[PDB]
Amino acid sequence: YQGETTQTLQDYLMWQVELTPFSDTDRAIATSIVDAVDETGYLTVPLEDILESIGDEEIDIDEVEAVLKRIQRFDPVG
Amino acid sequence: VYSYTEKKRIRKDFGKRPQVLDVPYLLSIQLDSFQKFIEQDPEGQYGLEAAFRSVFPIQSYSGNSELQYVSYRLGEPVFDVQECQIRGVTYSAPLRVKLRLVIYEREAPEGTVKDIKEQEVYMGEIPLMTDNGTFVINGTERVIVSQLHRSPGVFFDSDKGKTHSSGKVLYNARIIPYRGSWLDFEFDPKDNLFVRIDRRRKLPATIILRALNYTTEQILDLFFEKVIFEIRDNKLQMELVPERLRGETASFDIEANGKVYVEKGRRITARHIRQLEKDDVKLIEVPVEYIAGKVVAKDYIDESTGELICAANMELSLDLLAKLSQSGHKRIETLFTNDLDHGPYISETLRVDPTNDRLSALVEIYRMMRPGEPPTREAAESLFENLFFSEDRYDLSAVGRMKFNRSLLREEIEGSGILSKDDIIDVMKKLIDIRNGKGEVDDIDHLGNRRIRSVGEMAENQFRVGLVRVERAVKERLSLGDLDTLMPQDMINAKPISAAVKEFFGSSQLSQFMDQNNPLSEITHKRRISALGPGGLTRERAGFEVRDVHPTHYGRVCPIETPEGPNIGLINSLSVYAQTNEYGFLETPYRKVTDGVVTDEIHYLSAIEEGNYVIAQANSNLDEEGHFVEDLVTCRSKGESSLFSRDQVDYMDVSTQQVVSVGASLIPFLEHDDANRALMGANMQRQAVPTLRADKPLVGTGMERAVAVDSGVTAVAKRGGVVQYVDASRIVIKVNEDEMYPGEAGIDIYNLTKYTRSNQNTCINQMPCVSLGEPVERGDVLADGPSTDLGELALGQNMRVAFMPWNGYNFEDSILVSERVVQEDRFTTIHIQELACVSRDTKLGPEEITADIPNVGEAALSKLDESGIVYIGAEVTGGDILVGKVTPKGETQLTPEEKLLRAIFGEKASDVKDSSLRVPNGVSGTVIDVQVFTRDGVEKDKRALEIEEMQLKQAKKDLSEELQILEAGLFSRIRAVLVAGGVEAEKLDKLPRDRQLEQLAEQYDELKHEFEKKLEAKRRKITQGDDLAPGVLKIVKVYLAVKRRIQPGDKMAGRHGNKGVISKINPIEDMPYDENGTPVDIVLNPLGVPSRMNIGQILETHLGMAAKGIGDKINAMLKQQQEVAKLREFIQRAYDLGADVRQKVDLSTFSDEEVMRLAENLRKGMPIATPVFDGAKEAEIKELLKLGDLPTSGQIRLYDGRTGEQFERPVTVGYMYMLKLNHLVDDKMHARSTGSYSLVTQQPLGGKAQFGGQRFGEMEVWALEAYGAAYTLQEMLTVKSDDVNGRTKMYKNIVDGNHQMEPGMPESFNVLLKEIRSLGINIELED
Amino acid sequence: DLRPLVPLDGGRFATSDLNDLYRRVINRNNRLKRLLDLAAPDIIVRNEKRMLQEAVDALLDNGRRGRAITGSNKRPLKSLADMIKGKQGRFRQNLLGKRVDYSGRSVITVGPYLRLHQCGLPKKMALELFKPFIYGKLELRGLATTIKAAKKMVEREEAVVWDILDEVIREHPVLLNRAPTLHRLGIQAFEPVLIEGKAIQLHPLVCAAYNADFDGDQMAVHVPLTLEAQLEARALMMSTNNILSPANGEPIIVPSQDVVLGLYYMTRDCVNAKGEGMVLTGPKEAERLYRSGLASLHARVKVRITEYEKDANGELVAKTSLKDTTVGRAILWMIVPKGLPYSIVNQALGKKAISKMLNTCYRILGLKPTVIFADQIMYTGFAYAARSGASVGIDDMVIPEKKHEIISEAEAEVAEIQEQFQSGLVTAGERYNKVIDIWAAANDRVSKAMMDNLQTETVINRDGQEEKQVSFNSIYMMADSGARGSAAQIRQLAGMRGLMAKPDGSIIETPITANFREGLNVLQYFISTHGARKGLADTALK
Amino acid sequence: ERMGHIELASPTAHIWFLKSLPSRIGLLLDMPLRDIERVLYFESYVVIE
DNA sequence: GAAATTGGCACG
DNA sequence: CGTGCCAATTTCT
Ligand SMILES: [Mg+2]
């Protein structure tokens, strides 16, 4: 016996994050945004915790909101 | 005289040889085997009696108490076969054994028992065989295959002479018991005899002989003949037997009676032997040089000293001779050991033998058996006595004893089941005799040396295997003294016996799912002989000699029906007339010939007896009483065919088809087919799926009816009567008055099987073939089955075929098919598939099946009823929901966001998940059946009550019919009696039916009570719950049925090994046509006949055209209404055609409405029967082609459908019988781009149901390395298969329009490194 | 994660083999530690150390020192060594050969309309194999503005995804492979053509290389992804690149069975065929006469043929002359490319006279003319084989009239020698050898008589007299042209089958004197089974 | 990727370097395989120094 | 089952 | 002490 790899919600979200024309910083932000999504699809942390997880001084909350508004229209919508 | 079923459509028979023996019941082997196991036997053997008597009485270790055995009994099954199949349980019977416990008195073993207690005890359930030779185990029918193994006994078989480089032949023997340890005797290149026990290390042959309490003197007495030298006052005079000098050259001077008969250097001739015999010469004086190497027989001791002059069995010398002669000894015993005939083997073995005692031999055997433990005298003696001389560990069974005695040329057939000294001595003597030159080795492939073991014997063996463990448990428990309290029910436990019995029938190797895509597949699976399995050969080590046709297969095993592949010659099939005698050896019938006239007497001869007689052939002519026409007949004598005289014959073959099996006797014109193609045809004929409508072969062999009836797929009337009710799902027959039991309402009710699923996901469906109010008799069919037409086997369709090349669309076995074949749905099949939804019990509450799934919309729930199960008749597809199931998620603490979510959308949406059953991807069909199983205690929903109401609606119908008949009879009697006692005519009619008479009216009230009790008894079983599993609440099964049409890629075939794949579906106006404009259904390639040499498919084509030519005349006489006087005249002309045929059909005994009914069935072509090796000659096909006006050549001229111009040469058109094999292109096509990967080695999974990828193995890597394709090979090793980080990059690049890869490293080499370095080996990548 | 537990329905985490072998070792080690701490007597600690040694040995390599420990089903547990080595180990199952993506398989059928650089691929298999390409092409031209929109469009199979598929499969080779891959010609690259159905259509001429026939075979298709794989499949593995066998250097694209039958039937002559002796002005007039029905395909005529030959520099010079040929050869001359002589088709073309024609074309002209010539040869052969209306009947197997006389003479001789042995003149072995010789001579006599009767026929001449010509028998044409069949099969069809051999190998003296047009009785059919089972088992085991 | 280790309470011989026919331990110590097996599996003693 | 290598014993 | 034959063991379809 070996097993089989099932596709969860975060794997599906990453499959679309990698196929979206982001930038190097936008994809790093999207990784944190997708990581903090529970099984019901709701963001579990404030955007101030994602801006802190990025670990960059020049990124502002506007970019995080812009990336979140794009991630929010993936499949499933909402 | 014909039966009612055969009189509807009589198949014309071209056979010309009368039959004397009719084909037996084909499934007789399985039933006869199992009946021995089940039935009670007054003697111990043959069944459960043997198993019980081979263990009981079970007694304690000198506890003076034992368990006895009285008898056994089998109870009644709870459910019959159909209930066990629809319910998913086993059809078995409970076993009740009357056990008895006796308690004697201490110190008085002979004293009367102080207490006896007897009580029948349940010892598990044993599965029962149905009336068709199959077992249902878990709702599914299974078949236990017979086995062909080596018979127990002694077999002498030398090596071929290859082991030794010099080429010396090494002879050996072997004793094989039914249950025990082996025993081998063998020779070495040094010509000494050696013994091998249980295939262990080799030992000298005299170890066992000394362990049997023998001394050297008596050993030499047994194995040698004595010559006594007499010292008559000088120089070692000798007693002479003239025969001893045979094949000897004298090295000294032989002289007697004053005459030197033999000089020095003269070899004795036969003339000298005759002269010595005439003169009776006995005394010869020899010099001392003759005894320089002669061996002394016994021990000689000096009379003075009393010590040992010389030990036994060593050669004498001159000094030793002087020493033994100076001590006053007169007789010297020597062993006649001439090197040619009476060879010195055991004496010289004694020299190599280390021990010369009786007690150290047991020590040596104990060392050989169990090494590295101290040898104890008692332990060694017990081991030796338990090896071959204990009834509880060694069993040379009755077959083994018979073979042993008959091989040793004994007289008694029956004896004991344990070896003795005499048996081993005889085996050694026979081996030495074979070495000396009078004796032959056996062949282990003779069918007189191989035995048939069937289901009953194996079941008995497994039952004994369980019983011995039960016996061990009883013996261990009975040591404790509590006799006055316990009863026999407490001692034994039914779990081991039941477990062993169920493991034999459930998960053995010879117990397999029944092949159920034909009646022929079933009837040839039940009649199968397998050389594999537990106790038999192995596929890899089988060899080359067990896979060949032996001359003893004639009439016992079919030679042209065996799978082609890894196991060819190991899974052979039983013949038609073959049987098994009381010992399990196959035997075949023969017709006795006395004084050169065949006397119709049938004797069943086995392979051993068959070789003694001279047996004639089935194709030998005899003249009206039995007299061979030619005085130089053909016969088989001793396994070699040869030509014998007229008066030397002893037997004759009973039929011309007793050499071939059932499957190979359904091929017309078999004698015109190459033996390589007949095998393929017979193998492919049993994997043809049943089509929508059955079609008779129209060219057959006459074996269709036997296969159709014996395999229980039809509905055969149990008793004769008149059909009183006909329906698409039931038949009610009113039995005759002279076939009814006393006090019985005579009706037979047959419930037909409608659209049930078989083991191969095909359709099983029975349709009636009788009409309302027509007579029936016992034994004729009432309803057809899958692939059956009026009680005749029908596996395919009759296609109008032509042999010609057509623009390359029938190139290299391809088939070109017309469009009308697809329009008429001739090869359309129905496939049924089941799905299951199980609702289990979790810790956070149980799962429930409900129609309101929280997240899905109102459209997906459109085809679900109030109970959440799909409607019957709904056409599902893709991912439709079949069963609405919900599993509970709970124990989540409330939060303000969770409360806000729960308030707006309701509490039902929350705390529940969705686990509903959905149709898989790519699966479609129509819901035709839903089955609900509910564990007892759980409350049934509305659907599971509706199903039960439907089930109850039918038993009420049956009981109502019986009650109606009985009430009508009783009320008629009441009215008649009351009219006799007071005449009333009309006042009774208006009076209510309620109004000696008291006794008659009591019977009505009793009958009502009885038929009310029966209905309650049936309801109490209809409403009974199930026992599903630990933690399972409900199971819902849904069946989907889909119709598969024909298309390019589907595989079709024929009965002569001519398979093919459809390549095109050609429109009608493109197919070739003849003068009348009739197109051709199928076009075949003529370049397949000359090389394959299956000429039978062309004779079948011509005969089918001739047969359709008669139907085309009958149809033409029927369309324009003709008087019956012409119809019966033409049909009689058709049935009279032939050259000395055996069939006689006269239509003057047929009424007009029977001639019309026959001619209505004969309007699609007259069926024709051509038996194998006794078929229709070529000169009679041409008479049939002239009866209906057709060309004699069998070839007509064809026109091109596209250009309209005639083909330059005549082509062969006709009607051939085509099958649709179960290799559909719908189940073959597969594709994959990206899916799910494995876990440990992240590579794509394998298979079609897992959406797996194609394996790119080693041989395909070699082909890419030979081309020079390095990038194509690198992308199939890392990016497309295994490199985890490269798969996503490649996918992203392909979607981005950039075709470039970053190779990376496979993920299955890191696993290799981690597994190598977990063995303590430091492997690493460097630099 | 390399030794995971198996989750099966019912909440059961069944322990695997490696975890069992680790738990055993850990239990023994903990027991030994506790016993050594307690200062137990030396007997118990020695037993514990021995059992720990046995447990470690079973973990590292189970069963190497006898008595492999078994699981529930009495089957030995798999250790690390069993996972590394063997046919089921890492090396031979996951590293030297793997399962791959972008791959499918299905049953192969025949397409006679193809060119040998293209194959027929179902349009429902190519939609799955080429899916990321379809996504990229869909969202490249604005049909889908997101990956999920293209995913939905492909999922519901709209009417434009088929145009997208036809655009993306235009020039993109696919590798077709059939197992077993015995040599490098078992994997070849073709250009797809989208067909309707579920079966792959394979070009006929490439069937010899694959050793594939259409009676249930299946093939696997793989898609080259990168830009170097698409050029390796086009310049190295393409089907039009390998037309010579790498083993010996001979062509591997020879027409096989009913491509040579049509070319044999077309290129033949008859003594008094319709419209013979007339003078034609070229191949076009010959075809116009044949189609119009004014002349036969075998009529001997005179036609004006122009043929080109290469000079020293390589230029083509033409020569025109009147050839004595047939109508069928003039029609075939329209296919031969320029630069080849007319004597290459002015004969009856069997199977060896067609392969040498392609070899000559390859050696004189090149690779492209050879490919075009092979395709045209296949087309013409198929067309005229279909047009000929050839068939096979039961009257095409002409039994010689002298067969029974030969058999009777042989029987008389064997009876005479049987009596001679009965008189004691000869030994049993000598009698056996002489009987075998007699039957071997009778078989040859029957075969020669049958073949002399079969291979010729009579025909009325141009005038009233008669003449003799080669037979137009359907079976004789298949055997003589090399289409299919040989001499031995025709001998078994129309002459005695001959001497058979027992499984040991010794010849049975009494032969099978019956062919397949006649029947074999029960005893004559039981020895051919010995032979057939030997033959089948040999292949099945080799 | 992360491995672990078990601290054996007593030394244990590697079976690969013992039971492979060119016995690496036997060839190094110049002892027959039977002697090494009997010492390892606690059936006999051996003198060291 | 066949074949190659290794340890044990008869022999010179 | 030094060679060669024979039984055991292993690995491979
Ligand atoms: Mg094939």
Side-chain angles (χ1 to χ4, degrees), chain B residues 171-440:
Chain B
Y171 296 85
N172 70 267
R174 186 193 306 264
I175 300 181
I176 300 179
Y178 203 97
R179 186 187 71 257
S181 55
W182 296 9
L183 180 61
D184 195 324
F185 302 79
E186 52 188 358
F187 280 166
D188 45 71
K190 277 76 64 178
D191 200 359
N192 297 125
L193 185 46
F194 275 69
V195 157
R196 181 186 306 264
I197 302 184
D198 211 329
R199 301 175 61 179
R200 221 70 61 85
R201 181 183 67 88
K202 192 181 63 179
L203 264 70
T206 331
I207 296 301
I208 173 76
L209 206 51
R210 294 191 177 278
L212 293 183
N213 191 15
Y214 280 92
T215 62
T216 305
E217 302 177 353
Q218 43 197 163
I219 288 176
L220 299 185
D221 176 287
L222 290 172
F223 288 85
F224 285 111
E225 187 173 350
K226 304 297 182 181
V227 178
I228 315 299
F229 295 160
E230 303 186 340
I231 309 182
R232 296 204 61 87
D233 200 12
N234 198 27
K235 283 308 177 64
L236 292 309
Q237 299 185 4
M238 175 183 60
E239 299 171 332
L240 173 62
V241 180
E243 183 63 25
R244 308 305 185 91
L245 294 181
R246 175 189 296 266
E248 294 186 3
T249 304
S251 179
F252 61 95
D253 192 75
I254 302 181
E255 50 190 356
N257 198 21
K259 188 179 187 302
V260 182
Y261 299 89
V262 188
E263 301 180 1
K264 188 176 65 63
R266 287 296 199 277
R267 52 192 187 98
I268 302 95
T269 61
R271 188 173 184 175
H272 300 171
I273 298 179
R274 297 183 186 92
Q275 292 186 11
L276 295 182
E277 290 177 3
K278 180 180 60 60
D279 301 330
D280 194 6
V281 174
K282 295 184 177 182
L283 192 58
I284 297 292
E285 182 184 8
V286 305
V288 74
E289 298 186 7
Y290 178 77
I291 323 101
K294 305 307 175 183
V295 186
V296 59
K298 62 184 302 178
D299 278 334
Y300 277 155
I301 55 179
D302 195 1
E303 304 301 322
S304 178
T305 66
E307 297 295 332
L308 183 67
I309 296 185
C310 54
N313 189 46
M314 59 185 196
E315 58 277 1
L316 299 176
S317 59
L318 191 145
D319 51 358
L320 292 177
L321 277 170
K323 292 176 183 179
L324 66 89
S325 301
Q326 64 91 10
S327 51
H329 290 96
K330 278 73 182 178
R331 298 298 168 267
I332 282 81
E333 301 182 358
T334 52
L335 314 174
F336 180 70
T337 61
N338 56 334
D339 202 10
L340 290 185
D341 204 326
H342 296 51
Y345 311 110
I346 183 63
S347 177
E348 283 65 8
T349 301
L350 281 161
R351 274 73 171 274
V352 194
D353 200 63
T355 53
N356 51 13
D357 73 319
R358 197 263 181 185
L359 198 138
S360 182
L362 300 118
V363 175
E364 286 168 314
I365 297 178
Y366 192 92
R367 290 163 41 92
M368 154 201 203
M369 284 293 126
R370 302 174 181 176
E373 62 183 27
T376 308
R377 175 192 178 187
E378 297 292 333
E381 179 258 334
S382 298
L383 174 62
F384 181 78
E385 199 71 14
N386 282 211
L387 273 185
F388 303 142
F389 304 88
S390 60
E391 298 280 354
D392 315 327
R393 286 186 172 92
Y394 194 84
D395 192 7
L396 197 69
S397 56
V399 194
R401 174 54 59 184
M402 185 204 72
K403 297 291 292 185
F404 206 80
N405 289 17
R406 205 183 47 78
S407 179
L408 296 188
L409 267 302
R410 305 265 197 87
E411 180 62 28
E412 262 285 66
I413 291 300
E414 49 186 345
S416 56
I418 58 177
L419 288 180
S420 59
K421 309 178 302 179
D422 301 329
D423 304 328
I424 305 179
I425 267 67
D426 293 1
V427 169
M428 272 188 291
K429 287 183 177 180
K430 180 64 180 304
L431 178 56
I432 296 182
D433 224 334
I434 289 186
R435 175 61 163 88
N436 292 339
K438 37 174 173 297
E440 311 87 359

Side-chain angles (χ1 to χ4, degrees), chain C residues 22 25-26 29 32-33 36 45-46 49-50 52-54 56-58 60-61 64-65 81 84, chain D residues 6-16 18-21 34 37-38 40-43 45:
Chain C
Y22 278 121
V25 175
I26 298 174
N29 189 27
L32 183 53
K33 287 177 176 293
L36 286 178
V45 311
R46 286 208 304 257
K49 291 179 181 179
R50 179 190 62 86
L52 171 61
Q53 168 89 50
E54 295 181 0
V56 176
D57 293 1
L60 291 184
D61 198 336
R64 192 156 196 83
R65 201 193 169 270
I84 291 184
Chain D
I6 302 176
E7 292 267 2
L8 298 178
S10 62
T12 300
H14 200 308
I15 191 175
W16 271 17
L18 167 71
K19 288 297 298 181
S20 288
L21 284 188
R34 188 61 251 182
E37 281 190 12
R38 289 199 285 101
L40 281 178
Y41 287 85
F42 293 87
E43 302 180 17
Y45 284 79

Side-chain angles (χ1 to χ4, degrees), chain A residues 28-29 31-33 35 47-56:
Chain A
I29 297 179
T31 299
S32 295
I33 294 183
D35 172 58
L47 293 182
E48 291 80 19
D49 277 8
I50 300 177
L51 186 59
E52 182 181 1
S53 82
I54 297 306
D56 195 1

Side-chain angles (χ1 to χ4, degrees), chain B residues 971-985 987-988 996-997 1000:
Chain B
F971 267 50
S972 180
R973 265 201 294 178
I974 286 186
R975 297 299 196 187
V977 169
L978 81 92
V979 166
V983 282
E984 307 195 15
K987 35 193 171 302
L988 292 178
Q996 188 179 358
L997 193 146
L1000 206 49

Side-chain angles (χ1 to χ4, degrees), chain C residues 409-437:
Chain C
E409 294 175 0
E411 291 177 354
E413 295 183 11
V414 303
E416 176 268 354
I417 193 191
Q418 174 71 15
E419 298 301 326
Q420 174 179 342
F421 168 78
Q422 286 280 342
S423 296
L425 275 68
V426 292
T427 328
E430 187 175 0
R431 190 267 305 178
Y432 169 85
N433 289 123
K434 286 174 163 54
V435 168
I436 282 194
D437 291 2

Side-chain angles (χ1 to χ4, degrees), chain A residues 58-70:
Chain A
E58 55 185 301
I59 300 299
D60 38 338
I61 199 66
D62 313 322
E63 310 187 29
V64 185
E65 291 176 335
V67 179
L68 182 56
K69 291 209 189 66
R70 183 65 176 95

